[PDB]
Design a protein around this nucleic acid. Structure first.
Ligand code: K
Ligand code: K
Ligand code: K
Ligand code: K
Ligand code: K
Ligand code: K
Ligand code: K
Ligand code: K
Ligand code: K
Ligand code: K
Ligand code: K
Ligand code: K
Ligand code: K
Ligand code: K
Ligand code: K
Ligand code: K
Ligand code: K
Ligand code: K
Ligand code: K
Ligand code: K
Ligand code: K
Ligand code: K
Ligand code: K
Ligand code: K
Ligand code: K
Ligand code: K
Ligand code: K
Ligand code: K
Ligand code: K
Ligand code: K
Ligand code: K
Ligand code: K
Ligand code: K
Ligand code: K
Ligand code: K
Ligand code: K
Ligand code: K
Ligand code: K
Ligand code: K
Ligand code: K
Ligand code: K
Ligand code: K
Ligand code: K
Ligand code: K
Ligand code: K
Ligand code: K
Ligand code: K
Ligand code: K
Ligand code: K
Ligand code: K
Ligand code: K
Ligand code: K
Ligand code: MG
Ligand code: MG
Ligand code: MG
Ligand code: MG
Ligand code: MG
Ligand code: MG
Ligand code: MG
Ligand code: MG
Ligand code: MG
Ligand code: MG
Ligand code: MG
Ligand code: MG
Ligand code: MG
Ligand code: MG
Ligand code: MG
Ligand code: MG
Ligand code: MG
Ligand code: MG
Ligand code: MG
Ligand code: MG
Ligand code: MG
Ligand code: MG
Ligand code: MG
Ligand code: MG
Ligand code: MG
Ligand code: MG
Ligand code: MG
Ligand code: MG
Ligand code: MG
Ligand code: MG
Ligand code: MG
Ligand code: MG
Ligand code: MG
Ligand code: MG
Ligand code: MG
Ligand code: MG
Ligand code: MG
Ligand code: MG
Ligand code: MG
Ligand code: MG
Ligand code: MG
Ligand code: MG
Ligand code: MG
Ligand code: MG
Ligand code: MG
Ligand code: MG
Ligand code: MG
Ligand code: MG
Ligand code: MG
Ligand code: MG
Ligand code: MG
Ligand code: MG
Ligand code: MG
Ligand code: MG
Ligand code: MG
Ligand code: MG
Ligand code: MG
Ligand code: MG
Ligand code: MG
Ligand code: MG
Ligand code: MG
Ligand code: MG
Ligand code: ZN
Lengths: 150, 87, 50
RNA sequence: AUGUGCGAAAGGGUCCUGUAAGCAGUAGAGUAGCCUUGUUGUUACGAUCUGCUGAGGGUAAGCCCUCCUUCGCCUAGAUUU
RNA sequence: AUUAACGAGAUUCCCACUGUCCCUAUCUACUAUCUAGCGAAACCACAGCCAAGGGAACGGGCUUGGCAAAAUCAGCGGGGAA
RNA sequence: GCGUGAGCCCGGGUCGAACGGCCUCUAGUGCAGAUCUUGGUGGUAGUAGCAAAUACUUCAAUGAGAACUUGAAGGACCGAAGUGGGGAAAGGUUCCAUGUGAACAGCGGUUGGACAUGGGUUAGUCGAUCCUAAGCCAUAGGGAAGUUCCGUUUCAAAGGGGCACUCGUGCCCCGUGUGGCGAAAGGGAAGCCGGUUAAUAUUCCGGCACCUGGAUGUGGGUUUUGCGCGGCAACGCAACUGAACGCGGAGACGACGGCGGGGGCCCCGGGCAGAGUUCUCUUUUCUUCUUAACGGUCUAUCACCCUGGAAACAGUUUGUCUGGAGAUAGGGUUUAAUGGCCGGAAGAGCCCGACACUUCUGUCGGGUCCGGUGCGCUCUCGACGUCCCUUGAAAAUCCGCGGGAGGGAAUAAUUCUCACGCCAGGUCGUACUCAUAACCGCAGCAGGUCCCCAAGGUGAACAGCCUCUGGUUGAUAGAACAAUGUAGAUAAGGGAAGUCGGCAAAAUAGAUCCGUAACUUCGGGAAAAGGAUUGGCUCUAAGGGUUGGGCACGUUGCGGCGUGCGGUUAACAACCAACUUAGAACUGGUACGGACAGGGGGAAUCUGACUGUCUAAUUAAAACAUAGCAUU
RNA sequence: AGAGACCGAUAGCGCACAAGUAGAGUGAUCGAAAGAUGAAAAGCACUUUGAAAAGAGGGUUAAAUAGCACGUGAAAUUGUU
């Protein structure tokens, strides 16, 4: 008995690959009489032709390592292969910081904590490498208004 | 790399089928047949090859009209029908 | 190729109608000398020139 | 070809590595919860450490012993002088 | 005539390194090797054990001696002026 | 048996249609050699060999016969710059089904791209057909004995548009110009989803659309003084006359860099179904949860408009541009959906469950949700920037405008680019392969041959290594382990003593932190040279986003606001989210870029400045080219 | 159309035959091999062994020492006796 035609027809009807088609080993004579696509469907309904499941591929170990690195477990000096700028480029660090600092100054000026003359002077100070982060800018503003009070 | 490697790059055609003689001898870019000389009015023929002349001389084809002239000459190029024929 | 012209299509049709063996009753005629077909062509053996 | 026989296992000896899985602990840098607020207060997480443990694994394929462990086999078939 | 940088460009020395060497040993895979199946080519006057002699001045064959016992397998690189 | 000899004669066997002696005549008349010509056949010899691309094993069935046929079950490889899914050139039936003695598949064969008999390619929307490019060829003319050479707008009387016809015959305008071929990757009118076959499908069936050309009628629009209204404006609205002649726009264009928006893929959390594991653990691991063309409606950078008038200058990008030639601010208009919602459309497709059913046949229930994240990958759009002694096609075709020729109603008229309605769309290609077997290399040859799509982990990464979907298990086999080999490797002590010559091999190598000479065209040399660290576990610190802010009047089913104010919380509270960097303790046979991946260095001489190029198949160089300089 | 002191299938034209054919080359062009069963197919009915190809009997013929691998059937080279 030659069943090459039946296996090819089954894959098209089941919508799978020919490596996922199962033919009943004890009904080869009955299966060999199926020559049309209609007869293949009837043998699928009766349970002589089934589609096999996929092979296992799990990401359990992958997302386990990800969580351990959120608390700093696998990021030592013996675990780095690229350069510092390849892992975290400096241009991205600079671009983030300028957007953070410029977002704050617009917020203060809109509410009223500062006026435009102080806004302009702080803006060009931030363009220079003056304020290290958000905290440094806020402390500088408080001292500036304290001396302006006198 | 001349030889086996270079032979793999041959996938174009210098000549196609001629409309007058039927051989694959029509040059694709020049549009001139290398065998019968189409589209000139005369047919290409040279006296330094007797073999080539005999391959296409009169009598190598069908002679659709010329083969019935000797019979008409022998009877005098007459017209009409034989005496009291019907029709 | 799938792209063809009508002249090439006409040629390919004739080449396969001329590729069948001789009938059997030809071999029983009086004074016959034909044994087989001496002009058989195969796509894997001889290349036809367009 | 009945034997101090031949074969397949097993037990012991000899060598090689280096202390198995499992369970437990007043061991463990610390952390997060819950209560009567403890002299070990408990519940959860924890590389590793300690005990059972010179243990576990392998060992003739061209290592040794077994009348003192178990199971099987055997006085042919063919050719020639 | 000089000359920084550059070079799968030629040359000499130094440090490190090693079976390149003293001096050679051992292991793995595929062959070769044996079997079943399948199955070529180059080449070939006739052939195929030597020593000396003379000879076209370096013989497988001639002359005088040495000798000399079926059919065969794996390798080898002296000769066949291969 | 005869003859010195070339030769002649007879006996026996096989066989089946013509042949000889003697004298003259006549010639394509006698073979061992020519590396002689054509054909046939030996030894070598059952010999050399049939060894790149990791690999097969068990049971059953078929059959005279099974390592290389089919089913199931194991073990493996390709590892998304694939041994996957589709195409262009080229081939031409190699595609599908049934069957089969020989020959072919360098072993076998029940199998085959082989052999025999039948079957298979469906378009107004995908192409060709239309346009022009580099180029090729006609016409006017000039050469040449001539086959023919040049010439493409020229030293040419070179065209096209309208109106009635009694009925074609007849009238009237404009005129500088006047051929064709040439792209299945350039330019260009129009189709999407689901199903269906042994073999075709954006082509067949069902549903739902679109384009061009041709005729045409209803509804609506305009006009009673003739060809529409609104907005300060940018402009809007279902329409809303427009000939000759002319102006403009689209077609229509380079390479590279960072940044922002959108679709698809990847990743994380929850829920409903189904499956795998369960000595112990795991609210656990894996799979499905979809939405087309064509339309409606609300929005989305640039830019433009109105008010007003800026120095204590302001606005503002990751990247310094913008503004009295009018900024900030307040309010508007508009190019641009692959964005949200609705029609299409759940009736489809997909996942579960329960009954029928020899077949013919099926039938019925459920479900088909909700969020997050990013220097992620891929395609597309936008605003910016850099480079040039380099500035990056043409034509067909379609639209707007300037002008005002002609024509038209007061009961009808309307050459209204608005809605709906009627008819038609010819011809050729379409199967299959696109390569360790369908193309070219004499062949089923480790060679060569233009593209599209592109998953998880480690990691800087399209590096190497392992896996999922999909695909293979095909390269003659069985047994044994001699020499000599080809390919892969390790050696005590010495360390180039070997050799023409360190040829081959070994040694170094990622990342972080220190340190770095002579010389120099000041740019380099430079990763110069030379050092130290790196695992696991338990902790600590730093780098962000969104939403809230107190009174006094009036309106509104805690109101949301029209306001008059007051104020800068000595910056507080709640919620949300990935990664990157720095420090400490503990721990181990001191090991930790633990595989993969991965520079040896220095002091000098000769010579060419550098980057580039050549003898396809023995020479890659000091040879050629080059910028600069000089001469004619 | 008629002839010959011509050739007799490696000769005579390249071709006595489905020959300017099959086949090679991008192309111009290059270009073969291959005649004969018997007077007549009367071209082997039946039985038996074999999966089949075929063998052994038995038939036709004047002859199968003529079976379509077909008149006669030499040498090189090979098997048995
Ligand atoms: K233990
Ligand atoms: K112990
Ligand atoms: K060089
Ligand atoms: K050998
Ligand atoms: K053999
Ligand atoms: K001698
Ligand atoms: K002699
Ligand atoms: K006789
Ligand atoms: K043999
Ligand atoms: K192999
Ligand atoms: K393989
Ligand atoms: K068409
Ligand atoms: K139609
Ligand atoms: K066509
Ligand atoms: K057409
Ligand atoms: K042109
Ligand atoms: K002329
Ligand atoms: K085109
Ligand atoms: K069909
Ligand atoms: K109306
Ligand atoms: K209107
Ligand atoms: K273009
Ligand atoms: K983008
Ligand atoms: K994107
Ligand atoms: K996206
Ligand atoms: K991802
Ligand atoms: K469309
Ligand atoms: K100003
Ligand atoms: K930047
Ligand atoms: K790309
Ligand atoms: K008018
Ligand atoms: K098709
Ligand atoms: K197709
Ligand atoms: K193709
Ligand atoms: K990856
Ligand atoms: K990788
Ligand atoms: K060996
Ligand atoms: K060996
Ligand atoms: K040396
Ligand atoms: K020397
Ligand atoms: K290191
Ligand atoms: K010198
Ligand atoms: K160079
Ligand atoms: K060379
Ligand atoms: K070179
Ligand atoms: K040169
Ligand atoms: K100079
Ligand atoms: K001949
Ligand atoms: K040919
Ligand atoms: K007789
Ligand atoms: K007989
Ligand atoms: K005979
Ligand atoms: Mg920088
Ligand atoms: Mg050409
Ligand atoms: Mg009549
Ligand atoms: Mg001698
Ligand atoms: Mg001598
Ligand atoms: Mg000799
Ligand atoms: Mg002698
Ligand atoms: Mg040798
Ligand atoms: Mg020798
Ligand atoms: Mg006769
Ligand atoms: Mg002669
Ligand atoms: Mg001879
Ligand atoms: Mg002689
Ligand atoms: Mg051999
Ligand atoms: Mg092989
Ligand atoms: Mg070999
Ligand atoms: Mg195999
Ligand atoms: Mg691999
Ligand atoms: Mg693999
Ligand atoms: Mg097939
Ligand atoms: Mg078949
Ligand atoms: Mg074979
Ligand atoms: Mg065979
Ligand atoms: Mg077969
Ligand atoms: Mg065939
Ligand atoms: Mg089209
Ligand atoms: Mg011309
Ligand atoms: Mg002329
Ligand atoms: Mg054209
Ligand atoms: Mg195109
Ligand atoms: Mg229409
Ligand atoms: Mg107008
Ligand atoms: Mg929708
Ligand atoms: Mg929309
Ligand atoms: Mg503004
Ligand atoms: Mg809807
Ligand atoms: Mg449904
Ligand atoms: Mg197909
Ligand atoms: Mg392909
Ligand atoms: Mg190949
Ligand atoms: Mg081929
Ligand atoms: Mg990573
Ligand atoms: Mg073998
Ligand atoms: Mg070696
Ligand atoms: Mg050593
Ligand atoms: Mg040592
Ligand atoms: Mg040393
Ligand atoms: Mg070397
Ligand atoms: Mg260094
Ligand atoms: Mg140096
Ligand atoms: Mg140079
Ligand atoms: Mg060379
Ligand atoms: Mg070379
Ligand atoms: Mg004659
Ligand atoms: Mg002959
Ligand atoms: Mg002849
Ligand atoms: Mg004969
Ligand atoms: Mg017989
Ligand atoms: Mg006879
Ligand atoms: Mg014979
Ligand atoms: Mg004979
Ligand atoms: Mg003989
Ligand atoms: Zn021609």
């Amino acid at each position: 008995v030659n069943l090459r035609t039946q296996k090819r027809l089954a894959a098209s009807v089941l919508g799978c690959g020919e490596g996922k088609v199962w033919l009943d080993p004890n009904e080869v004579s009955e299966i060999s009489n199926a020559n049309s696509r209609q007869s293949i469907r009837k043998l699928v309904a009766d349970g002589l032709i089934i589609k096999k499941p996929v092979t296992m591929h799990s990401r359990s170990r992958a997302r386990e390592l990800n969580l351990a690195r959120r608390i700093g477990r696998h990021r030592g000096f013996g675990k780095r292969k690229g350069t510092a700028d390849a892992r975290m480029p400096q241009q991205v660090l600079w671009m983030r910081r300028q957007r953070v600092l410029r977002r704050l100054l617009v917020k203060y000026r809109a509410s009223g904590k500062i006026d435009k003359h102080l806004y302009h002077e702080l803006y060009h100070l931030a363009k220079g490498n003056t304020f290290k982060h958000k905290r440094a800018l806020v402390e500088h503003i408080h001292r500036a208004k304290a001396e302006k009070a006198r | 790399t001349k030889g086996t490697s270079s032979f793999g790059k041959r996938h174009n055609k210098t000549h196609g089928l001629c409309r007058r003689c039927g051989r694959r001898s029509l040059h694709n870019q020049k549009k001139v047949c290398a065998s019968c000389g189409y589209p000139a009015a005369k047919t290409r023929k040279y006296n330094w090859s007797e073999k080539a002349k005999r391959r296409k001389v009169t009598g190598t084809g069908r002679m659709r009209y010329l083969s019935t002239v000797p019979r008409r000459f022998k009877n005098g190029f007459r017209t009409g029908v034989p005496k009291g024929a019907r029709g | 190729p799938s792209h063809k012209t009508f002249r090439i299509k006409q040629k390919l049709a004739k080449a396969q109608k001329q590729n069948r063996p001789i009938p059997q009753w030809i071999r029983l005629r009086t004074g016959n000398t034909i044994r087989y077909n001496a002009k058989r062509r195969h796509w894997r053996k001889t290349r036809l020139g367009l």
